[PDB]
Design a protein around this ligand. Structure first.
Ligand SMILES: *[C@@H]1O[C@H](CO)[C@@H](O[C@@H]2O[C@H](CO)[C@@H](O[C@@H]3O[C@H](CO[C@H]4O[C@H](CO)[C@@H](O)[C@H](O)[C@@H]4O)[C@@H](O)[C@H](O[C@H]4O[C@H](CO)[C@@H](O)[C@H](O)[C@@H]4O)[C@@H]3O)[C@H](O)[C@H]2NC(C)=O)[C@H](O)[C@H]1NC(C)=O
Ligand SMILES: *[C@@H]1O[C@H](CO)[C@@H](O[C@@H]2O[C@H](CO)[C@@H](O[C@@H]3O[C@H](CO)[C@@H](O)[C@H](O[C@H]4O[C@H](CO)[C@@H](O)[C@H](O)[C@@H]4O)[C@@H]3O)[C@H](O)[C@H]2NC(C)=O)[C@H](O)[C@H]1NC(C)=O
Ligand SMILES: *[C@@H]1O[C@H](CO)[C@@H](O[C@@H]2O[C@H](CO)[C@@H](O[C@@H]3O[C@H](CO[C@H]4O[C@H](CO)[C@@H](O)[C@H](O)[C@@H]4O)[C@@H](O)[C@H](O)[C@@H]3O)[C@H](O)[C@H]2NC(C)=O)[C@H](O)[C@H]1NC(C)=O
Ligand SMILES: *[C@@H]1O[C@H](CO)[C@@H](O[C@@H]2O[C@H](CO)[C@@H](O[C@@H]3O[C@H](CO)[C@@H](O)[C@H](O)[C@@H]3O)[C@H](O)[C@H]2NC(C)=O)[C@H](O)[C@H]1NC(C)=O
Ligand SMILES: *[C@@H]1O[C@H](CO)[C@@H](O[C@@H]2O[C@H](CO)[C@@H](O[C@@H]3O[C@H](CO)[C@@H](O)[C@H](O)[C@@H]3O)[C@H](O)[C@H]2NC(C)=O)[C@H](O)[C@H]1NC(C)=O
Ligand SMILES: *[C@@H]1O[C@H](CO)[C@@H](O[C@@H]2O[C@H](CO)[C@@H](O[C@@H]3O[C@H](CO)[C@@H](O)[C@H](O)[C@@H]3O)[C@H](O)[C@H]2NC(C)=O)[C@H](O)[C@H]1NC(C)=O
Ligand SMILES: *[C@@H]1O[C@H](CO)[C@@H](O[C@@H]2O[C@H](CO)[C@@H](O)[C@H](O)[C@H]2NC(C)=O)[C@H](O)[C@H]1NC(C)=O
Ligand SMILES: *[C@@H]1O[C@H](CO)[C@@H](O[C@@H]2O[C@H](CO)[C@@H](O)[C@H](O)[C@H]2NC(C)=O)[C@H](O)[C@H]1NC(C)=O
Ligand SMILES: *[C@@H]1O[C@H](CO)[C@@H](O[C@@H]2O[C@H](CO)[C@@H](O)[C@H](O)[C@H]2NC(C)=O)[C@H](O)[C@H]1NC(C)=O
Ligand SMILES: *[C@@H]1O[C@H](CO)[C@@H](O[C@@H]2O[C@H](CO)[C@@H](O)[C@H](O)[C@H]2NC(C)=O)[C@H](O)[C@H]1NC(C)=O
Ligand SMILES: *[C@@H]1O[C@H](CO)[C@@H](O[C@@H]2O[C@H](CO)[C@@H](O)[C@H](O)[C@H]2NC(C)=O)[C@H](O)[C@H]1NC(C)=O
Ligand SMILES: *[C@@H]1O[C@H](CO)[C@@H](O[C@@H]2O[C@H](CO)[C@@H](O)[C@H](O)[C@H]2NC(C)=O)[C@H](O)[C@H]1NC(C)=O
Ligand SMILES: *[C@@H]1O[C@H](CO)[C@@H](O[C@@H]2O[C@H](CO)[C@@H](O)[C@H](O)[C@H]2NC(C)=O)[C@H](O)[C@H]1NC(C)=O
Ligand SMILES: *[C@@H]1O[C@H](CO)[C@@H](O[C@@H]2O[C@H](CO)[C@@H](O)[C@H](O)[C@H]2NC(C)=O)[C@H](O)[C@H]1NC(C)=O
Ligand SMILES: *[C@@H]1O[C@H](CO)[C@@H](O[C@@H]2O[C@H](CO)[C@@H](O)[C@H](O)[C@H]2NC(C)=O)[C@H](O)[C@H]1NC(C)=O
Ligand SMILES: *[C@@H]1O[C@H](CO)[C@@H](O[C@@H]2O[C@H](CO)[C@@H](O)[C@H](O)[C@H]2NC(C)=O)[C@H](O)[C@H]1NC(C)=O
Ligand SMILES: *[C@@H]1O[C@H](CO)[C@@H](O)[C@H](O)[C@H]1NC(C)=O
Ligand SMILES: *[C@@H]1O[C@H](CO)[C@@H](O)[C@H](O)[C@H]1NC(C)=O
Ligand SMILES: *[C@@H]1O[C@H](CO)[C@@H](O)[C@H](O)[C@H]1NC(C)=O
Ligand SMILES: *[C@@H]1O[C@H](CO)[C@@H](O)[C@H](O)[C@H]1NC(C)=O
Ligand SMILES: *[C@@H]1O[C@H](CO)[C@@H](O)[C@H](O)[C@H]1NC(C)=O
Lengths: 132, 104, 137, 448, 132, 132, 53, 43
């Protein structure tokens, strides 16, 4: 047990191992039953709603790629040469996840769109082949 | 400009008999006509509004049908309380005379 | 239950002016159920010629709309109350003639105690008692 | 054989109502000066609007049964009410005024419109009194029976002075549906406001809907595209307002020639009442000018489009508002924080059988009851300097008269009052639908 | 790319192909961090909560039928003769989805209930057979 | 049909059969479009947010164990002797679910943690074997 | 009063205490607060010892 | 005799719409709603 964000400076392998620790603390915090319009209750309601919607957006992004409920999901889109092409051993043994995000920050959106298209296409293919 | 015309002027009938009288218009007024009841010495009271819809208080014996230019008002199972004067109404236009139901 | 009460019968002379009041009460306070939403039509009933429409007054801003035959000689004013559940409607006919003798009715368009009939202004249920104006010499 | 196949994200919507939040351009508001319609609180709109055309889509629209206009009316009322909450309450200002007419350099047009009223108003110390004077318009003071006067709205409502820094300038606001809801925009150039719309588009936000409050004229508004459009709930019904839309500008240039000066009077511990102290220069009547040829034309287009509904052999006549309050019998609008009530009798007064400018005299009021709220009024503070406006008459709110039984003429007098009709001319093309992305369809598939 | 609701008037096949475009824009809109009690912030909070709960209801309806994370899901309940029995080619080549919803608008609830029962029954069957 | 919580006093087998009835009524209640700051609208907004976040927490707990969208899910963690060791027939024929919760109330958290660890480990194993 | 020509005086409630009470500012779920444990921190630049609270 | 002294006809001076003018009005207050100050003076 390394705690929340414990493997932030660790290797991407260890972070992939401990993903569940970060996954648990994404929706529930320390946040009595009644709602008040003082400053603190107001901010509390705002924080609850913000956490709910952010977690739901992340979950929707997972689900529409056909990876709902999976911490590690395998997809069908290859890696283009435009995206980072550094060695597998170096990425998975000599990196932290923060550096990897900093490196491929741009490109996120096109990768997501390719994931959407591939998921929809394979859904159509599965529906067509299952009808036989 | 609508020339509402209601006929006949009077309609004598017996108790329980059904009566009918029409309010002929000049142009197309769809179903925007209303029917009223003017008892002698009393204020007018609405009978049928929007052509076919029935007023809540009055029984279902009062029925009004029609679409376009010619509209029909029917009073089935006449009773001594229905003896009054009736007239149609399309927006601000009223018939010149109206129909007066009397007892045979 | 909106009730409309008018003024007493008046006997005038040709060239005079008559002002018939119309007290309305029981409309309600909530928007769409208040006196500032339901027009007060003024209907003239000449004995023999049937009913005649003279004009309507919308009590929110006093927007009036007179019939063509009466333009220039009829004026409508309001006295909408504070709670807007009641009010008073006036009509002045400033050029009375011998053919203007009739019974004048003020009417509204609220059939039911729980319906918003603001936009249906021609279901004239709440007729007033009737002010018998007699214009003769 | 057939088996149920559930599809998520189908392009299916149903008619429904929802809460439409606000979005506005950052550059629209100065970011330094507040607004009566709060624009800072609105989310920043996207620089590039995302309008998606829908082909083969016919949807039934109804501008007269649209919840968008009612929601906007409620929003504007709430904004106006909450803008006046922190402002000064002018309850001490109801005193007995010793008013005398201003006869210093006044033209005959405004001989008695202005009254120099001297009264006694509490200072910061409640045990000491102050004798101050102010210039009140005739419409803002009613005589009590020099003479004795009082505010016109002092036996019916409590006066709350509008905050001098809060601007009344209309700023465009985009009404955006929440996620899961879509706003359908009708791109048909000849849309009567009711019935199917062959060209239906989908937007996430509406266009820039300027909350311009006005009567008898739609100022600074959205135009028609092909022709002048006459749109009414029921053109046969004379009780329904007739909304007209102009395809070309009708520029109206307002001005307030008096150079008013604002004098701050301390009416309490920290409260200041701004009064019209003096006017530097000549006294002239406020007026609005409308090009004569441009109007007479625009009226020609209007009568040409109006003759369609009533027949080609009717004598269409326009006339001036008969009866009503000042908010209906005159063109009421707001020009730079000062409220104008202009006699639009010259604009109308015309009969249409089958360089010059029109000057409309205007009257200024400071005690304003905008939404006819019971027990609530507003005192518009004086605006320093000369006020000028250049607005566009983009529409009309007409009203047919009535029981012309055999007469061939049809008279159309102006008149507004209901601001919901004013804001219906902007939301006629918009419609809110609720996305139902879950659907079941039959296929030959079989779950394992 | 046809945009949001782009294939509304298109054939049900094209709409089934482009489902993902409508699926993306169901939770996130144009809707700074702080919460205010002016009219606009109030309406903004209401809109956020409404979108969140509607998306969650749709996702729950998908999940309890065993179709979570799937845009096109195959089920085990047949089509009764009471429900619309028009030809497969006509439905999938001559229809829009709006017309199809208008046609079967009433039989929705019973179809949903049959889906619930079938999903629960096959969950029990899978649990029983997996114990062997 | 036994209704919401109909099989509360019924055998755990019947409750496992009727799980879907309780599952349906966890997010949507009887809870017009506009938001008001009176007491009732305030409490209504609080109730909506509370229901949303509670359902989302339950769904997240289901998903991070690799059981998203499944009413009955089979896992890989055995039962320790510390936890209740009563007979299978007695548990599944002579019990209600309330009694079973009362019996194993404590222990919930460690069972959940074992589920997290097993799910993450088998995700890693599946990703590793699928790369071959 | 000194503040009587500029502001309106509101008397503080005698039962409301002005005693400072510690308050912990907590981030919502999905947000983390990074605490810099460096004992010589100039307030700007990298922090070698970063903790999460 | 049951309600001999329960009702009190109280006349007082109340501000009108103009704060510089006063109004003399009267009202009927129940005995439980008024307390004497030491016709007599009540509040
Ligand atoms: C423009 O002008 C037209 C014509 O006047 C208006 O259309 C009418 O609108 C009224 C309501 O405002 C409609 O009246 C209602 O009719 C119902 C029955 O209608 C059905 O059956 C008739 C049979 O001939 C059909 O023609 C019609 O299409 C319908 O299928 C009644 O059930 C209603 O009564 C109930 O509602 C009213 C109102 O709340 C209550 O007061 C009653 O107590 C009752 O609960 C009602 O009478 C009328 O039918 C419409 N005529 C049509 C559609 O041609 C337009 O509304 C008006 N404005 C617009 C926007 O176009
Ligand atoms: C719509 O157009 C019509 C026709 O132009 C217009 O009618 C006219 O209105 C004016 C103003 O209301 C009337 O003028 C008044 O007439 C009365 C007698 O009937 C006079 O006593 C009035 O005197 C004024 O001037 C005096 C001296 O300065 C003042 O002491 C006094 O208070 C008045 O201000 C004044 O002349 C005019 O008679 C009618 N004539 C018609 C019917 O043609 C109508 O007002 C317009 N409606 C609007 C503007 O909404
Ligand atoms: C709204 O605008 C209307 C149009 O401008 C205004 O109508 C005018 O109102 C004034 C009073 O405010 C009337 O004035 C009187 O008119 C009579 C008639 O004389 C006229 O003709 C003679 C020559 O025959 C001429 O010398 C006069 O100057 C007049 O033009 C005079 O005898 C009176 O002294 C007085 O001037 C106007 O007649 C009237 N015009 C019309 C076309 O009716 C209306 O008052 C405005 N009202 C508002 C602001 O609500
Ligand atoms: C608040 O104060 C105003 C001003 O005093 C009141 O307005 C005045 O109300 C009276 C009726 O109480 C009006 O009298 C009538 O005027 C017409 C004018 O044509 C006349 O024909 C009648 O014989 C009668 O005298 C008066 O005109 C009106 N004044 C104005 C300037 O509108 C108002 O009623 C008061 N409101 C309340 C709540 O009492
Ligand atoms: C219709 O829209 C026009 C703009 O397209 C509005 O005109 C503008 O009105 C504002 C407010 O009166 C003017 O602002 C003021 O300008 C003066 C001089 O620069 C300045 O001293 C004031 O502090 C204030 O900023 C603005 O100049 C004016 N623009 C034009 C083109 O004249 C008009 O008021 C709108 N009409 C409505 C909403 O009825
Ligand atoms: C609110 O009331 C206070 C107290 O009367 C005002 O403060 C006073 O403001 C005057 C402004 O001229 C100050 O006068 C100047 O004082 C300096 C002192 O060195 C002197 O050199 C100048 O010749 C002149 O006399 C006065 O000192 C000051 N009194 C204080 C601060 O106790 C205040 O300005 C008022 N605020 C307003 C008018 O909104
Ligand atoms: C921070 O980086 C150091 C250096 O890479 C990590 O320490 C090494 O970790 C690996 C894997 O456990 C060991 O095999 C090495 O022996 C460690 N250091 C040496 C001396 O080579 C360290 O673990 C990283 N931080 C965390 C929290 O994992
Ligand atoms: C300001 O207050 C003074 C004092 O009340 C007003 O002047 C007095 O008004 C009364 C009215 O009945 C007269 O009897 C006094 O003779 C007046 N003068 C005094 C007492 O010095 C004055 O009019 C008020 N200011 C206004 C209303 O302009
Ligand atoms: C008055 O109307 C004209 C014409 O509609 C407006 O001018 C247009 O403004 C838009 C936005 O800046 C431009 O895209 C158009 O090209 C302009 N048209 C012309 C012919 O100049 C003008 O802004 C309006 N004035 C207002 C609303 O105050
Ligand atoms: C509106 O039009 C009037 C004329 O109908 C203009 O009046 C003239 O204005 C100039 C410049 O101030 C003066 O020199 C003239 O003497 C005025 N003529 C009259 C008859 O008064 C007025 O300035 C115009 N103003 C606007 C706002 O357009
Ligand atoms: C309004 O009335 C006041 C008087 O009540 C005028 O002020 C006086 O004006 C004369 C002549 O300029 C001065 O001698 C006095 O000292 C002024 N008294 C003051 C300022 O209290 C004022 O000028 C009038 N305003 C207008 C525009 O007519
Ligand atoms: C309204 O005001 C505008 C200016 O704000 C006037 O427009 C100018 O008018 C002059 C004189 O005709 C022309 O030479 C200019 O080219 C116009 N352009 C500008 C400066 O905008 C307009 O004429 C005025 N018209 C009315 C109806 O008063
Ligand atoms: C309206 O009156 C004001 C006040 O006199 C004028 O502005 C002043 O002008 C003089 C120069 O003539 C300057 O010295 C002052 O500083 C100005 N005072 C201010 C800006 O408050 C103004 O110019 C007059 N009319 C207009 C609109 O020009
Ligand atoms: C709207 O309907 C038309 C007619 O069905 C569609 O156009 C046809 O689309 C198919 C499929 O792409 C083509 O094979 C045909 O050649 C097209 N034309 C005809 C005459 O059939 C059109 O695509 C539909 N709208 C959208 C946005 O898809
Ligand atoms: C409550 O318990 C009873 C049993 O005590 C359940 O009903 C049946 O009762 C008979 C009694 O002879 C038993 O033989 C049956 O085995 C019981 N179960 C069944 C499935 O028939 C009863 O169903 C329980 N309550 C609920 C809500 O199910
Ligand atoms: C209402 O106000 C009047 C005027 O202030 C009061 O009358 C005065 O009361 C004092 C009490 O000490 C007497 O000394 C005066 O002689 C009274 N003046 C008169 C009668 O004009 C009166 O008492 C107040 N209260 C009521 C209800 O009358
Ligand atoms: C102001 O004008 C009105 C106009 O009716 C007049 O009655 C009044 O006496 C005038 N006041 C003064 C002092 O000039
Ligand atoms: C409105 O326009 C549509 C066509 O867009 C037409 O079918 C309908 O009859 C028109 N009706 C009215 C009320 O103008
Ligand atoms: C306005 O134009 C019409 C023709 O469209 C013309 O008859 C009329 O005389 C013109 N202006 C006026 C009011 O004279
Ligand atoms: C089902 O819905 C369709 C919609 O067009 C309707 O025509 C039909 O009468 C409905 N019938 C039943 C059985 O609910
Ligand atoms: C602050 O300290 C860091 C080292 O911790 C150093 O890199 C940076 O330049 C310093 N800058 C300032 C503003 O003192």
């Amino acid at each position: 047990f390394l705690g929340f964000l414990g493997a932030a400076g660790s290797t991407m392998g260890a972070a992939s191992m401990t993903l569940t620790v970060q996954a648990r603390n994404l929706l529930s915090g320390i946040v009595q039953h009644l709602l008040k319009l003082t400053v603190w209750g107001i901010k509390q309601l705002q924080a609850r709603v913000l956490a709910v919607e952010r977690y739901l957006r992340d979950q929707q992004l997972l689900g529409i790629w056909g990876c709902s409920g999976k911490l590690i999901c395998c997809t069908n889109v290859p890696w283009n040469s435009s995206w980072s092409n550094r060695n597998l051993s170096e990425i998975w043994d000599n990196m932290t996840w923060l550096q990897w995000d900093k490196e491929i920050s741009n490109y996120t959106q096109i990768i997501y769109g390719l994931l959407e298209e591939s998921q929809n296409q394979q859904e159509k293919n599965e529906q067509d082949l299952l009808a036989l | 400009g609508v020339h509402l015309t209601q006929s006949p002027a009077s309609l004598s009938a017996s108790v329980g008999d059904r009566v009918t009288f029409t309010c002929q218009a000049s142009q197309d007024i769809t179903n925007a006509i209303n029917w009223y009841q003017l008892r002698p010495g009393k204020t007018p009271k609405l009978m049928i509004h929007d052509g076919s819809t029935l007023r809540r208080g009055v029984p279902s014996r009062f029925a009004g049908s029609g679409f376009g230019t010619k509209f029909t008002f029917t009073i089935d199972n006449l009773q001594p309380e229905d003896l009054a004067t009736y007239f149609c109404q399309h927006y601000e236009f009223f018939p010149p005379v109206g129909t007066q139901v009397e007892l045979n | 239950h909106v009730q409309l009460w008018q003024s007493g019968a008046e006997v005038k002379k040709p060239g005079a002016s008559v002002k018939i009041s119309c007290s309305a009460w029981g409309f309600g306070t909530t928007s769409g159920y208040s006196f500032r939403d339901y027009r007060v039509h003024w209907v003239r009933h000449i004995a023999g010629q049937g009913f005649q429409w003279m004009g309507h007054m919308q009590p929110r801003y006093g927007a009036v709309n007179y019939a063509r035959q009466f333009q220039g000689r009829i004026t409508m004013t309001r006295e909408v109350s504070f709670d807007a559940s009641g009010g008073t409607a006036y009509m002045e006919l400033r050029s009375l003639r011998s053919d203007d003798t009739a019974v004048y009715y003020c009417v509204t368009h609220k059939l039911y105690d729980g319906e918003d009939a603001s936009d249906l202004t021609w279901r004239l249920d709440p007729w007033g008692q009737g002010t018998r104006v007699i214009v003769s010499s | 054989n057939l088996w149920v196949t559930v599809y998520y994200g189908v392009p299916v919507w149903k008619d429904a109502e929802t809460t439409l939040f606000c979005a506005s351009d950052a550059k629209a508001y100065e970011t330094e000066k507040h607004n009566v319609w709060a624009t800072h609180a609105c989310v920043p709109t996207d620089p590039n609007p995302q309008e998606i055309h829908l082909e083969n889509v016919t949807e039934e629209f109804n501008m007269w049964k649209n919840n968008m206009v009612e929601q906007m009316h409620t929003d504007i009322i709430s904004l106006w009410d909450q803008s006046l909450k922190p402002c000064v309450k002018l309850t001490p200002l109801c005193v007995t005024l010793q008013c005398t007419n201003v006869t210093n350099n006044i033209t005959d047009d405004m001989r008695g419109e202005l009254k120099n009223c001297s009264f006694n108003m509490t200072t910061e110390l409640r045990d000491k009194k102050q004798k101050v004077y102010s210039l009140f318009y005739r419409l803002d003071v009613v005589q009590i029976n020099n003479k004795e006067y009082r505010l016109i709205n002092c036996n019916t409502s409590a006066i709350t002075q509008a905050c001098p820094k809060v601007s009344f300038e209309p700023i465009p606001i985009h009404y955006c549906a929440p996620a899961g809801f879509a706003i359908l925009k009708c791109k048909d150039k000849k849309f009567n406001g009711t019935g199917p719309c062959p060209s239906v588009s989908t937007v996430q936000c509406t266009h820039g809907i300027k909350p311009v409050v006005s009567t008898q004229l739609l100022l600074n508004g959205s135009l028609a595209e092909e022709e002048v459009m006459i749109r009414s709930e029921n053109i046969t019904n004379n009780a329904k307002n007739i909304l007209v839309q102009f395809n070309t500008p009708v520029q109206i240039n307002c001005t307030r020639p008096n150079n008013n000066t604002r004098k701050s009077i301390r009416i309490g511990p920290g409260q200041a009442f701004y009064a019209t102290g003096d006017i530097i220069g000549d006294i002239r009547q406020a007026h609005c000018n409308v090009s004569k040829a441009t109007w007479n034309e625009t009226l020609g287009k209007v009568v040409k489009q109006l003759r369609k509904h009533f027949g080609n052999n009717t004598i269409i006549r326009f006339a001036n508002s008969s009866g009503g309050d000042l908010e209906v019998t005159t063109h009421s609008f707001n020009c730079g924080g000062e409220f104008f009530y202009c006699n639009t009798s010259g604009l109308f007064n015309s009969t249409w059988i089958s360089n010059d400018s029109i000057t409309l005299p205007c009257r200024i009021k400071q005690i304003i009851n905008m939404w006819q709220r019971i027990g609530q009024a507003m005192y518009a503070p004086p605006i320093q300097g000369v006020i000028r406006c250049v607005s566009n008459i983009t529409g009309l709110i007409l009203t047919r008269d009535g029981g012309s039984t055999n007469s061939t003429t049809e008279t159309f007098r102006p008149g507004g009052g209901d601001m919901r009709d004013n804001w219906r001319s902007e939301l006629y093309k918009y419609k809110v639908v609720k996305i139902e992305p879950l659907g079941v369809a039959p296929t030959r598939c079989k779950r394992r």
